[PDB]
């Protein structure tokens with residue numbers, strides 16, 4: 001079987017705290033003696049549209065920030081700002097601090113989200129960074145500060161922090177540097193996600209996973225050039241397939257003996273005919289939230 | 300906004316996962332208090348997969364024939380016994396990471412989270428449901444025998460499933476934590492197959508309600524719906540009471556869907572219980 005799997009969230013659960021400034025409360029990420037959270041926590045109801053974060057932060061003292069790790073209150077001894085993330089220095093290092101690093105992911109890459117409310121983890125799920133730099137996540141009010149991550153070798157790579165929900169229902173956030181994915185800004189002025197597309201390299205990887213698990217009904221005797229595939233796939237609103245993407249599919253092609261452009265011909269036919277009542281790995285749609293690395297890891 | 304197949308945070312279960320080795324077999328074990336639980340098939344050999352005598356195989360083994368690895372530490376086994384299809388290994392050290400837990404047995408149509416582990420090392424977590432045919436459509440890529448399923452109510456972990464084997468149809472079968480199998484399956488490498496599976500109708504209705512909350516209202520009598528749907532499981536009064544837009548109006552929507560996408564899915568998802576919708580949408 002093939003499941004959309006999230007990484008074990010235990011190493012991240014031990015880092016989620018509750019940050020309060022004024023009457024605003026959201027989640028923070030406690031690593032070493034620093035707590036990371038969205039800088040919009042310092043905004044009031046009149047600072048939602050055009051806040052000057054430099055002016056708002058200079059008016060704050062350390063005792064204006066209430067950091068709460070479970071039932072233990074953490075004393076803030078310093079505060080600074082980097083891009084859209086607020087850094088709260090506390091007098092206690094987190095003893096549960098795992099091996100970690102901050103990374104920025106590319107569109108199409110996947111990660112796991114630990115949805116938290118009031119610093120309390122409530123659920124974990126797997127998702128991908130859409131080509132339009134949005135997240136088709138599952139967030140309610142109080143989830144800002146939740147983080148996305150991958151685990152590579154018992155080291156936690158933090159790549160996402162949730163900041164806001166867009167009017168279309170999707171979500172936008174930053175890396176742990178405070179830099180937003182996409183052209184979005186931490187302001188409550190109407191923003192809209194660009195035109196989203198299907199992650200082509202992920203669908204091909206998912207098709208390779210279907211062959212690995214024993215499904216071959218979708219293959220055909222055809223091949224295609226890289227340009228002719230892109231000409232057809234882009235008409236179905238698929239992201240263009242680059243030569244780097246083809247190289248990434250290398251190991252899966254060798255493991256299955258099916259050339260990438262041969263699998264491209266299969267995908268071109270699947271888009272043309274649909275499923276015809278059949279399923280691939282339990283899905284009736286072409287799933288695009290598995291990277292070629294996710295396929296190899298689970299298989 | 301949004302709707303995802305959300306699993307419970309797995310941190311409380313990760314601290315319990317250990318590696319159990321017996322002979323040429325290595326799988327996952329659940330370390331709770333001073334007892335490690337794992338499938339009793341761990342004591343089988345290569346030549347004892349078709350018709351093993353577990354009573355005979357266990358009597359011939361001593362405590363030191365079981366090697367339990369908890370991180371970089373080897374736990375010392377001081378006792379071994381069997382409860383149904385689960386082996387219970389008594390160790391000399393209580394697990395300091397033992398959470399508040401209880402062993403429960405779930406019903407078909409209920410959901411839970413699985414922490415898929417590989418030889419004691421956790422690798423991934425996902426959410427799934429107990430199919431009416433008592434099978435699990437999970438992802439178990441070997442070395443995952445002994446992985447457990449659970450739910451979390453308040454701070455209490457309700458262990459409900461332990462994985463034992465995969466069926467020839469790609470689905471998986473297991474037991475509860477007391478060793479009692481879900482479904483008509485035995486722990487032997489024999490000819491067995493999963494029964495005709497049916498769709499959990501009450502979960503589909505709950506999933507349609509989650510779509511109305513998320514902005515999908517384009518498709519917005521009991522006995523009449525059942526006769527058409529049964530052409531899927533039947534709906535009871537408790538189903539409508541648990542799903543308490545009237546329910547019968549939603550059944551007419553589902554009836555108009557079975558004959559003649561929703562939340563990014565071309566299929567009617569049936570692995571979200573009515574409480575899962577409330578837990579995620581509130």
Ligand SMILES: *c1c([C@@H]2Oc3cc(OC)cc(O)c3C(=O)[C@H]2O)cc(O)c(O)c1O
Pocket residue numbers: 024025026040043047048049051140141142143144145163164165166186187188189
């Ligand atoms: C608020 C939020 C998010 O705050 C927020 C701030 C902002 O600019 C200052 C713009 C937008 O769009 C948003 C949001 O979308 C809000 O979701 C999140 C959370 O969790 C809390 O508690 C809060 O008060």
Ligand SMILES: *c1c([C@@H]2Oc3cc(OC)cc(O)c3C(=O)[C@H]2O)cc(O)c(O)c1O
Pocket residue numbers: 323324325326327340343347348351441442443444445463464465486487488489
């Ligand atoms: C074996 C297994 C599972 O062992 C197993 C035993 C059995 O009867 C004794 C029947 C079947 O069907 C199975 C399986 O399907 C195997 O998956 C699991 C794991 O993880 C290991 O390591 C192992 O040796």
